[PDB]
Each structure stands twice: as structure tokens, then as C-alpha cells.
Design a protein around this ligand. Structure first.
Ligand SMILES: [Zn+2]
Lengths: 189, 169, 191, 78, 52
RNA sequence: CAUGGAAGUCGGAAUCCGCUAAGGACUGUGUAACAACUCACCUGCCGAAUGUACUAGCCCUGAAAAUGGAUGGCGCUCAAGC
């Protein structure tokens, strides 16, 4: 609980120093992804996140220095963190969005769009054919590499990805999902 | 009780499996030999009933009547598209004018007749099998007459095309 | 230690009607009628508001208070069942021997009876008789799917179980021989 | 790499636990080429790790790699 | 040959179960006490031997 | 270190820090070794009291013998039992 007690002092000190704060809607952002984006903004700006701070921060509202803090209490809803930056709005406005990962299927994820596999030459050895056998895709061997004959619709959109399908997708370096950091509404923007 | 579409899939996949071993152990010294059904290197049949067939036997038989170029029609199966549109001319992909699904040439031409003998013989429609027998002008069964049901099938298939001729060819 | 008052409530949508008399519940809506007999339970029914049913027990023990929440969900199922029906699905699973099913509607006895043939390549023919009010269907969207539907959840589920329990393997490994008819999802007809 | 004679073979078959090495401030040269790979907040903060990773040799004299970290008084940009 | 998902469903009803060490009864996958009476509702349970 | 090979998960000995909202030189499944899955830990939703370890009353399991059978018998359940 060392950080738990510290959180009040750490939050109050940092918030006052930074004139403007960005609240960011972090949904399904991997720890590695969060670590790397920190490096881009590591030089300028500070990022802090914790469990919902509505009640604890409200105590600061009572004391006279800032009554506007109450205004943002309703805005924070769920799974959204906020970031402190001393820079101007325009340069940091859209700069943080840069970087997007391409997460492989997790054998249970729901595809937003239909996933289509085009015909072509994989270039992989003949031994890997067994994986293709389960999905039933027609295959032919050309120049000692597996060649897909005709395109086959892997899965209908909105259905959970089968465990067999997920393993195949990562090998071919094709995935529907793309994930990136998301900005929630900031200071009435 | 395999359906025609399912049966076609099994033949394809097994040929692919055999192809993988031939490809992996092929000697590079001479000959890029691989098994392809379109090349007439695969035949189908049942040893116990002594009936076997290859694509050419059906192709030439259909070539004689309602057939223009047998050799061009050789690569008319195993992929690409199969045609049954209102317009005679064939097209690529199974999409039709109204969106109805299209036939599969291997099942529609080769595999439709074979099913017909099995169900009729098992259901004891001797009159029907005789009627179908004369539709393609099949030859008479000689000695085998009285015994019907699971005995005709070997006899009718042997008369329709004996395995030995296909093997030698 | 006996609790002095235990109370539960039940909301009723304004699409049906319900009448209670000597612990004989009758629910009637746009899909039929259902009855139950709760004479084995000592509960007091009453009307709290214009659209809320109430039931209570006084000076009950621990073993006796447990039964209030049971009664609530039983009556709730009747209300939801009459206005939304129920629908179970079942799937075939086999390795070598295909399973064949026949569904013929009995005439003058109303109820349906199923027929299972060729189970694990078996020569016997086994027959099961459904309960009145349940309707059996063979799916047309997916392959090898059975669909059971009806009005009373207890009958629907019990009829499905009969089909599942009739198809068993004997004197084998049930870890390897995975043949049989099984249930795959439970839900309602509407929505 | 920066150690005492190299045991080519046959003498190294048994244990070979000769970990009694010594370091003072040379290790920082080995620090530099690591190019601050992953969010270490400059050399001063990250110094704690490399010493503690080399806990096998127990530094030298009365020093212990863990002992260095808590008494954080050394130059940070050096 | 069984389709993957099928294996999962059929195994749920046949394979993932606990077993009493006193009366060999077949128990749910999250039980803590046997439900029979000749064993005394014992609470020494073990998983069903998975088939490799 | 160890050795055919042991990348957290055959074994021996150590048991540190960075970034945090959080992550163990690790709890299992798994590979010849990798990979892959999961747990510990933290977070999103909800709206109020729970969680663990012990003690002794009645009841239950532990509790298998030979002609038909004995709280004296019939019978007794907010007892006609303690
Ligand atoms: Zn037990």
C-alpha cells in the first residue's frame, strides 16, 4: 500500500504543475504497447493512471484553489486514464495516435469484418500442409512450396475465431485486427 | 453414405497428401514426376467388385455424342468452374444469373449415374434399373438374372466397365 | 433461530393474466395456459402493487426459508415461457457410423416420437416418445442439428434428456468412444 | 568477457565456479553501447540493474553489487 | 475423425469430472464434497484421469 | 552452473532492478529443445458487510452370522424422543 498512500501526493503535485490534461480511452492496449508509446512522450509530458479517482480527487475541489476540477468529475466513466503534458495542444493533439500493433488472433476473439484469405504462394515447406488439412483449403505444390488454388472465406464476421484457425493466421502474417492508443474526449473538445 | 460433394473433397485431399511425399522425396537427378488427376494418372474403383474407371473412359464416351473436343475437355474438372446456365456457354465461378448455386462437373457428369444404380438396386426397382440400363444402351447381364440385390451391383458394374480394361489402358 | 419475515416479489408484464387459488397457479398469455400445484409449500401469496406479485413466509426456519427463491423462479419461468417460449438445440457426433433419425407425428395421440437408427453401427432400433406440448424439428440452416421447442421449460428439458440418455456406449472407453446425441445451446424462441 | 584466463577444455568440465573477479568503474564503459534500449530514464536510474544482474561475482573487497545500489551517490551522467 | 469443437462439447459431458476417493462417484468439475451417503460426504476428491 | 541437448517449469545454488495500474529469475498444461495455453498480480461493471482457522451438543458414515423376534408389546415425529 506504499503506492496507495503515495497516490494522493503524487497526483496532486503533478496535476497542479501541468496546466492541461489529456484523458485517454485505453481499451485493449497491451503492456508492451503502452511501454513503447511512453518512450515517444517520455521526454515531454508525464503519464499516470490508476483506479477511478472521483472521490479522492473531489476532496481537492473543496479547497478554494480550483473549483473547475468538479466539472470533469462526470466526464470520466470507465477504463479511461489521463495524462499530463506541458506542451501546446496542436502538436500533441494527434501526435500520440501514431503507432498501431497488429495483434494475432486469440482463439476466441470476435472479428469485426469477414476475414478473406487470397490465393498465392506461401513459400513454406511441404511439411506444413497438415495444418491446412484441418481447414480443408485446396492446395497444390509449385516449385516445392505450397500454393493456394482458390480463395476460401475463413470465417463469417462476428463469430468467435476457432482455435485451429487462430494458429494458421499468425504463421501467414495476416490478421484483421489493428490496435492503437485511443483519445477520449478531452477538456470539452 | 457420403454425398457427392463430400466424396469429391476426399479424393482431392488424399491426392494432395500423396503428392506431398512424392514431392519431398523426389530425386532431383531426373524427372519432375507428380501425380495429377487432370493428367489421367489417377483411377477409381473397387477391387472386390472388379469395377474401376478413369476420367478418360467417361470423357470419350461423352465425347462420341454431345462432345466436340475430347482432349480440350480433358481439363474440364478439378477446379475452375462447372456450367449449367440457361445459356449453353460456360462461365467461371459458381455465381449464376439469379444467384442459384451451380453444379460440379465431376459430380454432375461422372458421379450422378453411379449413384443411380446403387439406390435403385438396393430399393429393388428392377424395372427401373432395366429402364436405366437401356437409356445408355447397356449390354445384357447374360447368366445373372434371378439373383437381385447386392449381386447385380458387381455384375452390372463389371458389364458397364470391367476393371481390367481400365487398368491396362 | 427462526426469521420473523422473509419476502420476495415478482413483476408481471401487462400482456397476460395470472390467478392463484388454493396454491393452484394459472398463467395465460398469447401462447397458451400452464398450471402448477404448490400445495406442498407453506407460502402466503398477495398483491403488493398493480403489477407486482408478492409471496412471504412467517416464522420460518433455515431449511424452510430456502424454498422462497425456488418458488419465485418457477413462477417466473412460467411467465417468461408463456410470452417467449423455449427452444433447445442438439447436435450429432460420430466418427465412422452415421446416425439416422426419423420424426413422424403421431395421429390421435398428438405427441411426437423420435426414431434413432444405425447408432454406432447398431442393428437395434430405439424409439422415444416426447411429452405433450413439445414440437420436434430437423434443422435446415446447419447439418446434423435437431431442434426442440415448446411452452413448458420442464417438459422441454426433460424430453431432451430422454434422447441424450437413450444413446449410451457399454463396456468401452467413454474417453475414446465419443458417440451420442448431445445438447449444445439453450434459449428462447422469441428474440 | 572481461575476465581471467580462459579455460579452453577438460579443466572446465568440473563446476568451474571461479567467480572471484573484481570491478570498479570500468563497467560503465560496457554501459554506454547499450544505447538505453528500454525506458531506463538515463544512466543514473538504470545503474542499479547491471550491478545486481552480476550478483555471481560479489564485486570485490567488502563490496557487494546489492550494497552499491542502496548507497546511491555515484555520478549519474558519468 | 471428429471436428474440433465437437470434441470440446462431447468431452464436457464425458471427460472433465471429479472422482471421489471413497466411492468412485462421478462429480461435477467444481465440487468440494461427494453427494452420496455411503462415503459420508467426504471432501478428498481427485480429477478424472485425462486421456493422453 | 550443470550436459547429447534443459530458453521459468529434469536437477544444484542464488532470489536484483527498470516501467508502471500491474506482472514471480515463477503456478500448472505442453515441446527433443523452442513455440502456444494458464496461474499469481493489477484493471473495467455492480452496490454491501464478508473471509479463514478452531471448540462441542444432536444426527449421519465407519457398523459383517447363521430356526422368525423383540426399547416388555402395540405404536410414537411442535413426540408417547433428548
Ligand atoms: Zn464419495
Amino acid at each position: 500500500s506504499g503506492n496507495k498512500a503515495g497516490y494522493f501526493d503524487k497526483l496532486k503535485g503533478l496535476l497542479e504543475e501541468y496546466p492541461s490534461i489529456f484523458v485517454v480511452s485505453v481499451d485493449n492496449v497491451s503492456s508492451q504497447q503502452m511501454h513503447e508509446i511512453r518512450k515517444a512522450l517520455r521526454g515531454q509530458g508525464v503519464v499516470l493512471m490508476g483506479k477511478n479517482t472521483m472521490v479522492r480527487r473531489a476532496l481537492k475541489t473543496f479547497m478554494p484553489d480550483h473549483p473547475e476540477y468538479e466539472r470533469l468529475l462526470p466526464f470520466v466513466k470507465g477504463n479511461v486514464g489521463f495524462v499530463f503534458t506541458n506542451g501546446d495542444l496542436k502538436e500533441v493533439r494527434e501526435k500520440i495516435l501514431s503507432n498501431r500493433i497488429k495483434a494475432p488472433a486469440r482463439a476466441g476473439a470476435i472479428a469485426p469484418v469477414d476475414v478473406w484469405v487470397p490465393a498465392g504462394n506461401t513459400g513454406m515447406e511441404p511439411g506444413k500442409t497438415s495444418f491446412f488439412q484441418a481447414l480443408g483449403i485446396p492446395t497444390k505444390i509449385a516449385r516445392g512450396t505450397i500454393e493456394i488454388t482458390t480463395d476460401i472465406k475463413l470465417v463469417e464476421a462476428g463469430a468467435k475465431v476457432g482455435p485451429s484457425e487462430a494458429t494458421l493466421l499468425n504463421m501467414l502474417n495476416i490478421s484483421p485486427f489493428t490496435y492503437g492508443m485511443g483519445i477520449a474526449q478531452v477538456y470539452d473538445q | 453414405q457420403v454425398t457427392k460433394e463430400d466424396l469429391y473433397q476426399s479424393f482431392s485431399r488424399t491426392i494432395e497428401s500423396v503428392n506431398v511425399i512424392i514431392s519431398t522425396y523426389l530425386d532431383k537427378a531426373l524427372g519432375d514426376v507428380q501425380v495429377y488427376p487432370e493428367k489421367g494418372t489417377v483411377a477409381f474403383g473397387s477391387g472386390l467388385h472388379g469395377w474401376a474407371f478413369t476420367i478418360r473412359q467417361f470423357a470419350t464416351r461423352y465425347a462420341k455424342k454431345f462432345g466436340v473436343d475430347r482432349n480440350k475437355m480433358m481439363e474440364r474438372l478439378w477446379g475452375d468452374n462447372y456450367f449449367n446456365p440457361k445459356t449453353k456457354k460456360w462461365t467461371k465461378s459458381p455465381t449464376a444469373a439469379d444467384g442459384t448455386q451451380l453444379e460440379r462437373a465431376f459430380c454432375q457428369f461422372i458421379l450422378d449415374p453411379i449413384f443411380r444404380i446403387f439406390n435403385a438396386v438396393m430399393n429393388f426397382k428392377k424395372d427401373e434399373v432395366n429402364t436405366l440400363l437401356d437409356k445408355l444402351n447397356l449390354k445384357l447381364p447374360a447368366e445373372d438374372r434371378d439373383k437381385e440385390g447386392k449381386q447385380l451391383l458387381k455384375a452390372v458394374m463389371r458389364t458397364f466397365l470391367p476393371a481390367a480394361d481400365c487398368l491396362l489402358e | 433461530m427462526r426469521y420473523i419475515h422473509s419476502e420476495e416479489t415478482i413483476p408481471v408484464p401487462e400482456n397476460l393474466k395470472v390467478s392463484i387459488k388454493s396454491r393452484l397457479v394459472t398463467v395465460e398469455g398469447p401462447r397458451g395456459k400452464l398450471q402448477k400445484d404448490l400445495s406442498h409449500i407453506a407460502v402466503n401469496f398477495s398483491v403488493v402493487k398493480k403489477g407486482v406479485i408478492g409471496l412471504e413466509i412467517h416464522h420460518g426456519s433455515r431449511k424452510d426459508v430456502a424454498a422462497l427463491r425456488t418458488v419465485r423462479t418457477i413462477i417466473n419461468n412460467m411467465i417468461i415461457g408463456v410470452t417467449k417460449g423455449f427452444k433447445y438445440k442438439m447436435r450429432y457426433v460420430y466418427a465412422h457410423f452415421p446416425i439416422n433419425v426419423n420424426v413422424e407425428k403421431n395421429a390421435e395421440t398428438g405427441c411426437y416420437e423420435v426414431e434413432i437408427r444405425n447408432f454406432i453401427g447398431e442393428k437395434i432400433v430405439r424409439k422415444v416418445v416426447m411429452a405433450p406440448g413439445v414440437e420436434v424439428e430437423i434443422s435446415k440452416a446447419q447439418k446434423d442439428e435437431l431442434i426442440l421447442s415448446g411452452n413448458s421449460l420442464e417438459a422441454v428439458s426433460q424430453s431432451a434428456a430422454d434422447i441424450q440418455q437413450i444413446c449410451k456406449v457399454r463396456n468401452k472407453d467413454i474417453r475414446k468412444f465419443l458417440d451420442g446425441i448431445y445438447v449444445s445451446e439453450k434459449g428462447n424462441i422469441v428474440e | 568477457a572481461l575476465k581471467e584466463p580462459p579455460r579452453d577444455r577438460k579443466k572446465e568440465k568440473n563446476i568451474k565456479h571461479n567467480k572471484s573477479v573484481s570491478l570498479d568503474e570500468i563497467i560503465e564503459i560496457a554501459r554506454t553501447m547499450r544505447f538505453k534500449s528500454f525506458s531506463k530514464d538515463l544512466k543514473g536510474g538504470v545503474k542499479e540493474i547491471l550491478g545486481t544482474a552480476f550478483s555471481v561475482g560479489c564485486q570485490v573487497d567488502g563490496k557487494s553489487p546489492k550494497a552499491i545500489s542502496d548507497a546511491i551517490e555515484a555520478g549519474e551522467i558519468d | 475423425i471428429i471436428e474440433p469443437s465437437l470434441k470440446a462439447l462431447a468431452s464436457k459431458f464425458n471427460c472433465d469430472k471429479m472422482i471421489c476417493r471413497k466411492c468412485y462417484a462421478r462429480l461435477p468439475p467444481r465440487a468440494t464434497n461427494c453427494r452420496k451417503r455411503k462415503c459420508g460426504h467426504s471432501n478428498q476428491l481427485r480429477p478424472k484421469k485425462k486421456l493422453k
